Design a protein around this ligand. Structure first.
Ligand SMILES: Nc1ncnc2c1ncn2[C@@H]1O[C@H](COP(=O)(O)OP(=O)(O)OP(=O)(O)O)[C@@H](O)[C@H]1O
Ligand SMILES: Nc1ncnc2c1ncn2[C@@H]1O[C@H](COP(=O)(O)OP(=O)(O)OP(=O)(O)O)[C@@H](O)[C@H]1O
Ligand SMILES: [NH3+][C@@H](Cc1ccc2[nH]c3ccccc3c(=O)c2c1)C(=O)O
Ligand SMILES: [Mg+2]
Ligand SMILES: [Mg+2]
Ligand SMILES: [Mg+2]
Ligand SMILES: [Mg+2]
Ligand SMILES: [Mg+2]
Lengths: 258, 274
């Protein structure tokens, strides 16, 4: 037998082991193993919190953002920051209209504005405006919170990068940007799947595309990529749920504080 | 003379310019208007040069850099950096005494009947601090940097702004002296070592110690008060402070409005891109 569904949830509350694979010969040995792993998880958790208090660090998600950002600046990307509020018109230009499944996921603030569910609308706007000021390509990125009604969080942190303007072998260039990010995040091993998706062990962590010309008749060449940063951190740190590494009032850097 | 730029001219000058236009005086309307024309061209020229420099030398964002500079200083002092949700509950607001009758309540962006965009970081920081007290007998020192939201209406006010808030529960030594010292750490790390501390009235905290630069508030801080601590199950000396990071950046970089240094689709690091 295996751990019961309820035992798995109990083990994952304080523990970050891999519990779903354990197999046992009878209920007695399952229950003995469970008691031991619960005790170890809880004590390990307590020690980890005591260590953060004794030797505080930058938050794990902030650190991951800084590691990636310094890699992208070194590659010539400008960091931008855009508003969390976006307009209904802006969503509709992303083709996010009443009929699109994503539309039902939007948090509205009033009749005309919403919490952004992705960074792309704002980033494309900023890229196009920066291209008005130069003959060369423009490469930018943003990291920030996005929101969707719902490895899913209602508030999650997206990294979005974009490259607009003259570029040769766009697809190879985009794959290299993905490499830069994944390597800077400490996740060098990953699969590319088909638009390009990045997966680790079947779990999508990025969606990227060349030429998303989805207002103007004539477009600049453009490519971009969006990464879920809590997902990357969860996979790298081997946290047993996606709720432990990001923003929380129950978890702090993988450890449960209550 | 006594003639100033008109209010509309000041707004037009500040759109692309970061000069100090409100100080200019003129003898008559003709001279005012000629100066306006000249200073508008200068402002746009200077703006274009800044944009071209940013394109030629890609960099981290100014607000992100300020956040990193302050955060590293606070971690060096033993503060834990936390990140908490932007969503908070109506009950959490009530525990801060932000209820239907209070003016700040009118400023809250509601997401549904029971949840709002946080207008301040204290509700979540109080929760995390109290839980961390369960794991130590010593001081509990935490901070968060992140977006807060208020309906506003406009000088030095944004609807979305970035607060740095810190909390210190059970400090070693006098709570007010410790608070003043951590304010000093933040302000020096921000590159703004010259500031005044001024006692100010508060609906939530009764009285705050505010950080003011040339009369402009950039931080409110408070020890307690006791009723507010006890509402969050805190029963020991406690203090905290909340800094407006865009206001700090605006003053340090001498930007002419508070809309230029933070998140924007029109401005990038003090320059207008459209
Ligand atoms: N609710 C969410 N919680 C956490 N991360 C998310 C969430 N939605 C998207 N992401 C991350 O943001 C990236 C942006 O991609 P995209 O908007 O296409 O996601 P998606 O197709 O809705 O994802 P999924 O199928 O996993 O729900 C996703 O690859 C994922 O890494
Ligand atoms: N709308 C806003 N835009 C930008 N910064 C803000 C805004 N509201 C508050 N802040 C910053 O957050 C800090 C802590 O918030 P606090 O509640 O004390 O502000 P406040 O007393 O309402 O400010 P003010 O009187 O300027 O409106 C303030 O000192 C200020 O620097
Ligand atoms: N008046 C402003 C700024 C302010 C002042 C004192 C505070 N004291 C605290 C103590 C413990 C935990 C959090 C806080 C907190 O953020 C806090 C914030 C506001 O709250 O927005
Ligand atoms: Mg989805
Ligand atoms: Mg996807
Ligand atoms: Mg106010
Ligand atoms: Mg005030
Ligand atoms: Mg104040």
């Amino acid at each position: 037998v295996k751990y019961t569904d309820a035992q798995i949830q109990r083990l994952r509350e304080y523990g970050n082991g891999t519990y779903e694979q354990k197999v046992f010969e009878d209920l007695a040995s399952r229950d003995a193993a469970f008691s031991k792993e619960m005790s170890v998880a809880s004590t390990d958790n307590e020690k980890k919190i005591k260590g953060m208090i004794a030797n505080p660090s930058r938050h794990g998600l902030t650190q991951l953002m800084n590691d990636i950002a310094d890699a992208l600046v070194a590659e010539g990307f400008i960091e931008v920051r855009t508003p969390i509020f976006i307009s209904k018109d802006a969503l509709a230009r992303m083709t996010i209209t009443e009929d699109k499944p994503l539309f039902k996921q939007v948090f509205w603030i009033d009749e005309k504005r919403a919490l952004r569910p992705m960074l792309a609308p704002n980033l494309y706007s900023v890229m196009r405006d920066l291209r008005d000021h130069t003959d060369g390509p423009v490469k930018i990125f943003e990291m920030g919170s996005c929101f969707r009604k719902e490895m899913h969080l209602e508030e999650f942190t997206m990294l979005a990068l974009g490259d607009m303007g003259p570029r040769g072998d766009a697809t190879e260039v985009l794959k290299n940007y993905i490499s830069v990010v994944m390597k800077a995040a400490g996740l060098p091993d990953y699969d590319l799947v088909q638009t390009i998706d990045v997966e680790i062990n079947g779990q999508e962590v990025c969606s990227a595309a060349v030429g998303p010309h989805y207002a103007h008749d004539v477009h600049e060449p453009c490519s971009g990529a969006g990464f879920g940063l809590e997902r990357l951190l969860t996979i790298r740190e081997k946290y047993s749920t996606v709720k432990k590494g990001g923003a929380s009032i129950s978890y702090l850097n993988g450890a449960k504080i209550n």
